[PDB]
């Protein structure tokens, strides 16, 4: 049962856990154990070796959004002279899912090869939990009464089990799915309700909108007034219009009260307001919660936050000295590259003895909505509270290609938020094609404390959308002590 | 004929000339005249109000490349489950050209509105030339014996007439076209030869490749071993492979010696080697030369360089005090945003009395090839001569989508060149989808003297191609005193 001492035992072979494990083994020559619940994607556990991103997150959803974008490309090609039989166009969901599955499986297999070929980096199949401060027990199932496969003696323990979809406690919740199941639907739904205002709901609404069979309809509902809270307000409003223009129904200030089955097997959703909707799939995407319930954290007294995340300091330390937590389990920025950076920083701190912490400010991120979002740093509302004088530079225009394409609704939006006292760029927010690619090097600019003048004195690359960031010299409006106004008082 | 004094007379209403004119009129309250040969795009002189970029350059080119990209999208859609009758797919070139024409004409019309609505900004139709230091004459044609339309008295003169396609002196050059005429072909050529290894040749090869009718073939020829001289060598090699994979024939070490007309109107090209090729169109894209012949610069003695550009200092000043030159006529970086920047800087210097100059280093640019290129700063061969220790960081990978799409040849290439003594990024070179958009903010990073660690300590955006720029920690190889090697001593 008991193992030889590992320097590090990682529970969860995902984005953060694999970076920590790999770095500890290869950069510092340490003996590392990594635990996960299966070696390949999909039911019943969905996540697997590689993590949520590889298996049921960033990687497959990006492939599926790319697939969905072809609906727009096929239509838009006509404006540039492409002609074909429109009545022959069919979207084969089964083919998409099969191709996605092969791609994810290849990644699963490549991670299996990493463990085989790397000395001092060992994989253990099963469910990890804390028996004591220096013992991780690996059992056959999530049930703590299931059979022990081994006990891993651990000098250090890393909790990196990620998050899991939140499901509301409403009648007929068992008739709904999450993003996990959406990845394995045997057929594309004719009618679908995506529940939530966040990026997962918005992204899947776009995917379903493109692959739906004839006479179909995608509806997104959100309990508050405006989707995508935490993103730039102009972009939130503008994405809503552009989703609507592509046939997606957006129900704001609406929330399901119950779901029941119609006699034909479809789902009848009743909302709190009294509204109803019949759909084939109800996909819940209202949040993700830290995955702590199976770790038996009470055995060692690892503290959780009020919201349920493992409580950590800036260096990923729990209240128990040799036990650390990174990634989505900490309930902060649920992004793969953040988990990776936290894992790397942790290993440098613990095994390199040079403390390093992840900077959670000015992190660039994206929403692969159609059209997509790219963002880095503060929205103007948040900046207006932290700084006395804030300037907002805004450009909004339909690119010339979309006059020709017939998608006149596709406005590109670029916004730069600054501290007007010294011109320091506090945030950049982009909506439109290429936005996720444009924003990466903007992340590097914000790390370097770029000012607005560093942007407008840089020579543009023409013709691009990106050059709009270097063409904004004069603020569109300001915030003075929190108060919006077009001009500054003298 | 002789006007009242203008503060500035601009010859050429293009990228640089319009920026200068607008800024001088609106920011400094000056009285400005701008001269161009046409009010809208197309034959006989092609460029017009708006410049080369608007009329027969960046703007229409980009729309046409966007059109061409749909051949790849339609094909690649099948990998993601899209099904349709492939046998019904046709590319209507006439429809592309008509849409392009409307878009460009709208821009021409908006520029007419600018002149109508702006006090002290006046447009004059005709051919500008220098009569004397303080007089620009506007004539009916480029012939200096043609009729005078008016004489413009000028306190300052800006030469901003751009450039023009270079045509080799071969027998049957009259049977060839340039990029100018390519924009107005009534039908897409079944067979086309694009002559030259530069960006225009490569871009048009991609355009013609997508719109060619059945049984078609695009051939690109270049007189030396490898296309795209001046770009990163890895990218030059890789883009050659990717063009070939999309069906374009690349003829290196070949150059046309003559062209004759076949009896069906097609062209018979004979190369210097003795090889021959029959094509429907021969597009010369061997270079662009400064447009100085019609300005009568000998009347005032404005100095040209040995290459033929108007000689200028770093502030765009000629050898004659009140006469300046910006844009492609200076024969340096032939890019629209550089011409614009030069025009703004000139006006601040002359009318603001606060001297400003354009920085011609670390300028980001793109090639809208399929796949496209984005680049900023130095290639490693140039860096290795100027710096003692240079590191090259390189990543080349086929993106995951392109396993599914069936275009496995579409490798993304990311290269960072640094001064290894302090880690300062000297250049960044990208090949693959998104490269032109990725490289813009990289331009800003280089202005801020970004080091390699500023890239690899920035958190990635995932999944993107761009995040490869933040994932390269260890050099792939070095140059030490100009000598390539895998490891340092
Ligand atoms: C639909 C969707 C789309 C997303 N898109 C993006 C995107 O575009 N960009 C982006 O940056 N982020 C995206 N994310 C977020 C990203 O997936 C996460 O932030 C990231 O995966 C978190 O990494 P981690 O190391 O915290 O945990 P994960 O990568 O989730 O790994 C946790 C692993 O632990 C395993 N595990 C759980 N419990 C146990 C146990 N008791 N014993 C052993 N193993 C266990 C799981 O099987 C899993 O493989 C997306 C998420 C979802 C759901
Ligand atoms: C096919 C092609 C594609 C290109 N693509 C790009 C790109 O993607 N990105 C990029 O940055 N650059 C591109 N360029 C380069 C860009 O177009 C030029 O750098 C830019 O237009 C130069 O601006 P300018 O002010 O020097 O002159 P121009 O914009 O060329 O303007 C010169 C004007 O002067 C007029 N003129 C000439 N002689 C006289 C006279 N005697 N009297 C009156 N008027 C006169 C012409 O009609 C013309 O309108 C491209 C060029 C070509 C040919
Ligand atoms: C009677 N035939 C004739 C063909 C008519 N069809 C069938 N069809 C279809 C699509 C998927 C599964 C089964 C049938 C389509 C539906 C609508 N079009 C939409 C094409 C869109 C419209 C604009 C842009 C996006 C895409 C572009 C043409 C590129 C595709 C073909 C269509 O127009 C078809 C059916 O038998 C198939 C079954 N039908 C159904 N379930 N409603 C319709 C009748
Ligand atoms: C960020 N990585 C840490 C992860 C380490 N490894 C090592 N490794 C490996 C595989 C076989 C033998 C030896 C080592 C891999 C390399 C490739 N990965 C696949 C990564 C995919 C690519 C696309 C998406 C899914 C996952 C994402 C990058 C998230 C599997 C395992 C891997 O990810 C740093 C690396 O330098 C590790 C070493 N690398 C390499 N040997 N090619 C490249 C990347
Ligand atoms: C179905 N018929 C007529 C359609 C054949 N055509 C005509 N045609 C065409 C294209 C432009 C103008 C005039 C006629 C094409 C030839 C070229 N292909 C292009 C294939 C594209 C290339 C990129 C993407 C779209 C499709 C993909 C590979 C999916 C479609 C249209 C095509 O496949 C075919 C036959 O008559 C010809 C072959 N047959 C025979 N030798 N006995 C019998 C059947
Ligand atoms: C520094 N200037 C350079 C030249 C100024 N003007 C002023 N102007 C104008 C037009 C009518 C009445 C008064 C002033 C224009 C506005 C935009 N242009 C249209 C040209 C488009 C804009 C961008 C690309 C597509 C085409 C390109 C210039 C190639 C016409 C002339 C213009 O370009 C830039 C702007 O003034 C241009 C106008 N701007 C805008 N509408 N948002 C941004 C600032």
Author numbering:
A (entry chain A): 0 to 489
B (entry chain B): 0 to 488
What does the literature reporting this entry say, word for word?
Of these, Trypanothione reductase (TR), a flavoenzyme that reduces trypanothione (TS2) to its T(SH)2 form, is of significant interest. T(SH)2 and TR represent a major defense system against oxidative stress for Trypanosoma parasites, similar to the glutathione (GSH)–glutathione reductase (GR) system found in humans. Despite the three-dimensional similarity between TR and GR, these enzymes recognize specific substrates (trypanothione vs. glutathione), suggesting the possibility to design specific and selective inhibitors of the parasite enzyme without off-target activity on the host. Targeting TR thus represents a viable approach to reduce Trypanosoma virulence.
The structure of the complex between TbTR and compound 1 (TR-1) was determined by X-ray crystallography at 1.98 Å resolution, allowing the identification of the binding sites of the inhibitor and the definitions of the details of the interaction (see S2 Table for crystal parameters, data collection and refinement statistics). Inspection of electron density revealed two binding sites on each TbTR monomer, unequivocally attributed to compound 1. The most significant of the two binding sites, indicated as site 1, is located inside the wide trypanothione binding cavity, where it partially overlaps with the so-called mepacrine binding site. The binding is dominated by the hydrophobic interactions made by the core of compound 1 while the arms of the molecule are more flexible and point respectively towards the inside and the outside of the cavity. The phenyl-triazaspiro scaffold of compound 1 fits well the hydrophobic/aromatic patch composed by Trp21, Met113 and Tyr110. The bicycle-heptane moiety extends deeper in the cavity, into the hydrophobic subpocket lined by Val53, Val58, Ile106 and Leu399, and is just 6-7Å away from the catalytic Cys52 and Cys57 residues. Thus, the binding of compound 1 in the cavity is incompatible with the binding of TS2, consistent with the competitive inhibition observed by kinetic characterization. The second molecule of compound 1 binds an almost hydrophobic cleft, indicated as site 2, close to the dimeric interface of TR. Therefore, it is reasonable to assume that the binding of compound 1 in site 2 has no effect on the catalytic activity of TbTR and that the observed inhibition is due exclusively to the binding at site 1. TR-1 structure is very similar to TbTR in the apo form or bound to the substrates indicating that compound 1 binding does not induce global or local conformational variations.
